[PDB]
Amino acid sequence: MQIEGCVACVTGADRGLGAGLLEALLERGARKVYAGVRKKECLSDVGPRVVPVEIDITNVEQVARAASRAKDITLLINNAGLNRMQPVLEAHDPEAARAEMEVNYFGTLNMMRAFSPALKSNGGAIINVLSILARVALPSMASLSASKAAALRMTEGARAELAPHRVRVISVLPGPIDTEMSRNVPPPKIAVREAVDAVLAALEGGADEVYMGAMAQEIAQGLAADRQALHARLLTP
Amino acid sequence: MQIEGCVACVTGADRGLGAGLLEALLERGARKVYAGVRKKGPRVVPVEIDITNVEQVARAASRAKDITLLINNAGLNRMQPVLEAHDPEAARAEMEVNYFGTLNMMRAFSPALKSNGGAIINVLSILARVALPSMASLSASKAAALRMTEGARAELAPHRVRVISVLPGPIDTEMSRNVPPPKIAVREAVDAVLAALEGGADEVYMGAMAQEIAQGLAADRQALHARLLT
Ligand SMILES: NC(=O)c1ccc[n+]([C@@H]2O[C@H](COP(=O)([O-])OP(=O)(O)OC[C@H]3O[C@@H](n4cnc5c(N)ncnc54)[C@H](OP(=O)(O)O)[C@@H]3O)[C@@H](O)[C@H]2O)c1
Ligand SMILES: NC(=O)c1ccc[n+]([C@@H]2O[C@H](COP(=O)([O-])OP(=O)(O)OC[C@H]3O[C@@H](n4cnc5c(N)ncnc54)[C@H](OP(=O)(O)O)[C@@H]3O)[C@@H](O)[C@H]2O)c1
Structure with missing residues (x-):
């Protein structure tokens, strides 16, 4: 599907990747x-076409x-994370x-369950912003890794349940992005603008497991x- | 790390795979x-x-400070x-x-394992690696446990504790009553779990379904x- 004319919901829209996604969705129509x-x-951007929720x-x-106030939704981006x-x-x-x-x-x-009824009715798509660590733990952040792996299995099951109802479900798996979340992670980190572009470009590709950036690609290829x-190599100190 | 002479703790020891593991641990010394x-018998301490x-x-954990082998077998x-x-x-x-x-078990028992030396085996599931739609929340919980096992393996490796995951397909126990045949026999599953201590692999796939899924992933x-989802 196209960004042009969509009705989107982006969680975590006040800063970081979500703020970037909000701005790009607006610019792209x-x-x-x-x-x-x-x-x-x-929220610093409350202008026309933006409905703060x-x-x-x-x-x-x-x-x-x-969800009850967003029954016209066609694109859900589950971006909030910790x-x-x-x-x-x-x-x-x-x-x-x-x-x-x-x-x-x-x-x-919770978001998948509450917003799926409207997405099934309207047609549309869900993008879940996960992490490359859904595929392998980094020991210093292994509990984040576990939560993102759980979310990846959940995304797979949701894709199967929603496929007969013409709702596409995509996982995006990034390495480090230059936001407040990664303040303590040394560079190089993916620029927010590049990460925004890669999330939105996933709608135009055929893959439902999308790796963002060099680290994520290298881990997927090596696995x-x-x-x-x-x-x-990665798990022996 | 041999079973012979070890001090083990296995959860879920009253039925299924855990009961088979209890029996085999005793038989193997x-x-x-x-x-x-x-x-x-006196070598069994119910807890x-x-x-x-x-x-x-x-x-x-406070009453098991001599432990050298933890098998996290309980599951839902x-x-x-x-x-x-x-x-x-x-x-x-x-x-x-x-x-x-x-x-919880990893956190509470790791101090004694680090002191004595030993091993942890976590019984996970092949579904830690891919969802089946009808069991996707089970899959999610086991995937979380697999990442956690990897992190714990790295934390414990410098401290004389080996950490292994076991990833079975269906086993013939009460848990899988509604899964149609074929299912791994309990005794075969027991043998595969305990053999993991003698192998060098950090992930052990139990049974043909699990091995085929791992190869395909x-x-x-x-x-x-x-095939599994759409
Ligand atoms: N290196 C990275 O930054 C990195 C790497 C891989 C994946 N990701 C993922 O990318 C996504 C965006 O994160 P980011 O990099 O933009 O980090 P960020 O700058 O810290 O922003 C996180 C966003 O999530 C929101 N959030 C957290 N908990 C929430 C909750 N309970 N309910 C609603 N919103 C909540 C925050 O809201 P508040 O402003 O109210 O706190 C904020 O808008 C996350 O899913 C993250 O896991 C990031
Ligand atoms: N097809 C399969 O059977 C299959 C496939 C893949 C992986 N596995 C894994 O293999 C392991 C053993 O399961 P099983 O096949 O032997 O199934 P089972 O015969 O149903 O036994 C499950 C065991 O887990 C215990 N348990 C559950 N919740 C517990 C809790 N909160 N605290 C303590 N013990 C708890 C049960 O205790 P009670 O008897 O007190 O209820 C029982 O001893 C599990 O981790 C399971 O996920 C099994």
């Missing part, structure tokens, strides 16, 4: 964008309220793993070519 | 097995462990899709057992996805 934010005061994706009531950057065992915060799972898996799932060798 | 069960109950997990499959689930919280229930419960990925 979207009819309307529901800009999901946790505090409407956080309060959505903490972990809050089932806010998600339901948003990376607490902690290992699974030696975590400073033992509850961080549960918080990441709550946003990246249960929150995305296919020699899974065991790559694991032994 | 474990000097002591902490048999984790939800409702309770009350709901793996989602952090206090029961902590109490069990609600067999529901992610979107049209009959129970909207089935996904949360599976995540609680298969991810958070296994994580590396070498035939787009077509395998289409």
Whole structure:
């Protein structure tokens, strides 16, 4: 499908990749964008074609309220996410793993469940912004990795359930992007503008598993070519 | 790491694969097995462990400081899709057992394993690597557990603890009563889990279905996805 004339909802639209997606959807001729934010005061772009909607994706009531006000949706981009950057065992915060799972898996799932009825009725597409770490843990962020892997399996199951109803479901798997989430990750990081372009370009390709950037491509190719060798290298300190 | 002489703990020891593992560990010479069960010979120490109950997990670890082998076998499959689930919280229930419960066990027992040296085997599922639509929330919880196993493997490798995942297809236990044949016999599954300690692989695929899916996810990925999902 085309961006031109679509009715989109983007979560996490107040900053980072989501703010970039909001701006690009507008520039490329979207009819309307529901800009999901946790505090409407956080949004700097509230002009024409933008409908700010309060959505903490972990809050089932806010998600339901948003879906009921967005029955014209044709494109959902599940962009909101949380990376607490902690290992699974030696975590400073033992509850961080549960918080990441709550946003990246249960929150995305809440959005899928609430917005799918309208997408089935209208036709359309869902893009889930996951991570290359859905495919392999980085030990220092292994609980983020686990939450994104759960979200990838969920995206596969949702694709199967929605395929007979003409709703396309795409996963995008990036390496590091230059946003506040990765403030502590050393460069090189993908520029937001490049990441925005790659997310939106996924609608024009045929792949439902889309790797963004060199790191993500290298990991996917290495896992296919020699899974065991790559694991032994990446997971032995 | 031999089973002979080891001190093992296996969860889910009252039925299915865990009960088979308890029996085989004894036959193969474990000097002591902490048999984790939800409702309770001299080499067997029954221990009350709901793996989602952090206090029961902590109490069990405090009474198992001699452990050298942990087998995280307990698991739950609600067999529901992610979107049209009959129970909207089935996904949360599976995540609680298969991810958070296994994580609780890893966190509580790792200190003694680091002190004694030893190994952890996590019984996951081939569905950690790809969803089946009718069981996609089970798949998600096992994929979470697989990434967690990888992270734990890296954290524990410098501290004399080997961490292995086992990824079976269907096994002939109560969990898979509604999965049609064919299913791996419990005894074959037991042999494959315990043989993992003598092999060098960090991921062990159990049975022909699991091996075929693993091969396809590396070498035939787009077509395998289409076959399972669309
Ligand atoms: N290196 C990277 O940055 C990187 C790499 C791979 C994948 N990704 C993924 O890319 C996506 C965008 O992240 P980013 O890089 O733009 O990070 P970011 O700058 O930290 O922005 C994260 C966004 O998610 C929102 N969010 C977090 N928890 C939320 C919740 N419970 N409900 C609603 N919104 C919530 C934040 O809202 P508030 O402003 O209200 O906090 C913010 O808008 C995420 O899914 C992330 O996992 C990022
Ligand atoms: N086809 C299959 O059977 C299959 C396929 C792939 C992977 N696996 C995995 O193999 C492992 C063993 O399952 P199984 O085949 O032996 O199934 P099973 O016969 O149904 O046994 C499941 C076991 O898990 C225990 N358990 C569940 N929730 C628990 C909790 N909160 N705390 C403690 N114990 C809990 C059960 O305890 P109670 O008896 O007290 O309920 C039971 O001992 C699981 O991790 C499963 O996911 C099985």
